[PDB]
């Protein structure tokens, strides 16, 4: 936006997770809100690092516009981000692919149906087919 | 005297008169302002005492 002037406070480094973490406040006067991708690329350019290494989340807009205050996170590589950032954040940024887990109800129904069967069930299927066709 | 029937005689027989249309009254702080400007600068009601709803005399 206009005069974003992205500031990063409390920039304590985190060698344990191989990242630099900071609270990021962006001032966007005369603007609704600045998008996640724009903030990610701006932080990457300002930190001289790859865009996929940086990550930002939990952006709370102050009352009446002007600025939003949130949390920032930049890693030491892209593999570090891929291994430490969670799956939802990775698919949010597009660096990963959303899993196709079935919904909880039908997943649990499948679990119960498989639990009620003992073994691989090949013998059960063969016996059932023989009895039904006979 | 004696009424087991005729219950609601007056409520049924009273001549209906509709609520006449009047300018909408303000609500909230506006109504508080109306009350203040009706009871503290319009103190002309005094006749020895301040009558809040004087009869049309």
């Amino acid at each position: 936006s206009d005069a974003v002037t992205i500031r990063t406070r409390k920039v304590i480094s985190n060698p344990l997770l191989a990242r630099k973490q900071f609270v990021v406040d962006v001032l966007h006067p005369n603007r609704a809100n600045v998008s996640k991708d724009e903030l990610r690329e701006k932080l990457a350019e300002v930190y001289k690092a790859e865009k996929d290494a940086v990550s930002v989340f939990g952006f709370r807009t102050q009352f009446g516009g002007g600025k939003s205050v949130g949390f920032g996170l930049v890693y030491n590589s892209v593999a570090e981000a891929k291994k430490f950032e969670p799956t939802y954040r990775l698919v949010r940024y597009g660096l990963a692919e959303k899993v196709e887990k079935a919904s909880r109800q039908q997943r649990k129904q499948k679990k119960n149906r498989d639990k009620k069967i003992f073994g691989t069930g090949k013998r059960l299927a063969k016996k059932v087919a023989r009895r039904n066709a006979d | 005297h004696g009424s087991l029937a005729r219950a609601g005689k007056v409520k049924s027989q009273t001549p209906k008169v509709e609520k006449t249309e009047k300018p909408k009254k303000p609500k909230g702080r506006a109504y508080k302002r109306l009350l203040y400007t009706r009871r503290f600068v319009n103190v002309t009601l005094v006749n020895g005492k301040r009558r809040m709803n004087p009869g049309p005399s």
């Binding site: - | 005297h1 004696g2 009424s3 087991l4 219950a7 609601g8 007056v10 409520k11 049924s12």
Partner: protein, 144 residues
Amino acid sequence: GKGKPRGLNSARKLRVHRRNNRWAENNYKKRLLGTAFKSSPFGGSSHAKGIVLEKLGIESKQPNSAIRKCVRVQLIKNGKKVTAFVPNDGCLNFVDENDEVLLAGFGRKGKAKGDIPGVRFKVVKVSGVSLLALWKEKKEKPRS
């Protein structure tokens, strides 16, 4: 010596004297015996649904003169029959025979109001519809 014991070791005597004397209190005895649970028609309840058995005209007490409209309601939850007042003009015509009516207290705790003899309860809802709503035309009685 003002009758009551004053000794520094008379705490038991004071406690027991108070225990005996508290029974004379109207509300304390009622709560302790649980007459609300035992004997009161509502069983200590703020309201009670019932089925009206018949309409009644109860003459008002002196110096008043009028025929207050009432209903003989048998409570669904208790089976006790109580007289209930229909407290608004013309609202008696709303209540019919065998209509489910909600009963509430009359304000005076277990007593009667003014010139009504022996009526301690009043109707609030008829077949789930409020008496004042039916009176002021805000609702329409299903009559089903």
